[PDB]
Design a protein around this ligand. Sequence first.
Ligand SMILES: Nc1ccn([C@@H]2O[C@H](CO)[C@@H](O)[C@H]2O)c(=O)n1
Length: 205
Amino acid sequence: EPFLIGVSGGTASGKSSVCAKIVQLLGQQKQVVILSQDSFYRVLTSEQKAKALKGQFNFDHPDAFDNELILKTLKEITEGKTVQIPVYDFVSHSRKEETVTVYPADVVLFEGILAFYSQEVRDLFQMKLFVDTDADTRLSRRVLRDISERGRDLEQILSQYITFVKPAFEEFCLPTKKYADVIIPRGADNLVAINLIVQHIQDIL
Ligand SMILES: Nc1ccn([C@@H]2O[C@H](CO)[C@@H](O)[C@H]2O)c(=O)n1
C-alpha cells in the first residue's frame, strides 16, 4: 500500500530538492522513491518537434504531458505493482527507448510542474505539497540549468519563458496551489516546514 505524495510548484522552485530532503530526513526502515512528471512528456510529432526546435511549442500546458500514461503508471504503483517509467531527453524533445524500472516502495513522491492539474491524478495523492519560490530566483536557476543541462541559448530560454513558462505557470500551475495540504515557501531551505511534513508522514506510518 504505497503512500503517494504529490509535489508541485513552478519551474526551478526546488521541487526535487524538497523531495530529496524528505527522503533524507525519513532516514533519520522505509523504502522511498522519487518520480518526476517530466519523465512523462508526450511523444512529439514531426510537426510539433519542428515547432519546439523553433521555440513555438508550449511544453508548459497540461496537454504537453502524457496525462493518460501518468494516471496509468501511478495507478499501478498504487496497486503495489512494479512499473516502468519512460526516460525523456530535453535536448531533442524525445522519449528515449530506454525505460527505468521502479519497484514497490512504502512512500512514492511524484513531483512536477502540473502534478495537481488533473483531478484523477490529484485524487491518488494522500498528501499534496506545493513549493513556492520567488519567480526571479526560479528564472535565474532555469536559465543556468537550461544552458547547462539542456544545451540551450540565453535569448531562446528567456523568450520561451516570457512566451510560455510564465503565462502557463499563472494559468494552469498556480491555481493548483489551493489543492495543497502544505505550501512551502523558500523550498528546501524551509527545514521547519519540511520537518513537520516528515513528522506527519511518520505518524501516519
Ligand atoms: N522538450 C521540453 C520539455 C519541457 N521543457 C521545460 O521543462 C520545464 C519543466 O520541467 C517546463 O517549464 C518546460 O518549459 C523544455 O524546455 N523542453
